[PDB]
């Protein structure tokens, strides 16, 4: 609670400044402080929170993949250093995911009553369990994978009942859930099916949108198509 003495509005303002400065660790600490004020988050604030932690954990994941590759080639060389340093980065990454999952559990999800907020937070919960699953090997690897799948599934169920198929939150949830199927659950056919069905239902709803909403939805649709091109 190093941010406990700062005003909620000042934390949000500084998160935006940190984003402009590409200081994403600062950004995430500011947004964590804002969440810990206990009030619900607006749409803009939810996106600040996600952007901040996505960039933090993204750097850790990229580092972990570099070190994992070196470790595997060194085991195909001697000394514990590569394993030690990989484990260090892995432990840091797990700590960030635990932090995010802790904010969602205390108490963002339980207070989220609207479709847009509940789906957003359940998608985040799936994402950060997915990041844990990327490095998991031990007793709980299967439990971690099913925590991701369950969060994504609950988000999908709400999103199909409460949001149009072009809604960018719904589209991004489907994109990331399809990545989960391909990369984590060893279910490439499920990944491809979900990406194609999501793309096709969004295409048939584009005619409703304004020009600005059209640009938002088609940007994510392009990512679905990019994945399908990689996978097929």
């Amino acid at each position: 609670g190093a941010m406990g003495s700062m005003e909620r509005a000042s934390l949000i303002q500084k998160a935006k400044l940190a984003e402009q400065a590409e200081r994403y660790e600062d950004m995430a600490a500011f947004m964590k402080g804002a969440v810990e004020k206990g009030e619900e988050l607006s749409c803009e604030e939810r996106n600040l929170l996600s952007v901040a932690y996505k960039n933090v954990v993204g750097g850790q994941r990229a580092a972990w993949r570099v070190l994992s590759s070196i470790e595997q080639k060194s085991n195909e060389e001697k000394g514990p250093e590569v394993r030690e340093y990989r484990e260090k980065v892995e432990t840091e990454l797990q700590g960030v995911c635990d932090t995010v999952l802790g904010l969602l559990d205390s108490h963002l999800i339980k207070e989220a009553g609207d479709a847009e907020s509940r789906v957003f937070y359940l998608k985040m919960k799936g994402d950060y369990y997915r990041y844990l699953a990327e490095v998991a090997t031990g007793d709980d690897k299967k439990r971690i994978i099913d925590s991701a799948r369950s969060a994504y599934q609950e988000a999908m169920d709400i999103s199909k009942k409460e949001m149009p198929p072009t809604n960018p939150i719904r589209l991004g949830l489907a994109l990331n859930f399809s990545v989960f199927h391909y990369e984590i659950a060893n279910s490439p056919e499920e990944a491809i099916s979900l990406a194609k069905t999501t793309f096709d239902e969004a295409m048939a709803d584009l005619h409703t949108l304004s020009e600005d909403s059209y640009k938002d939805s088609t940007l994510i649709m392009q990512l679905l198509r990019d994945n399908l091109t990689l996978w097929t």
């Binding site: 996106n47 991004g172 990512l223 994945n227």
Partner: peptide
Amino acid sequence: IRCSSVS
């Protein structure tokens, strides 16, 4: 290439 995902 790696898969695309969003925040």
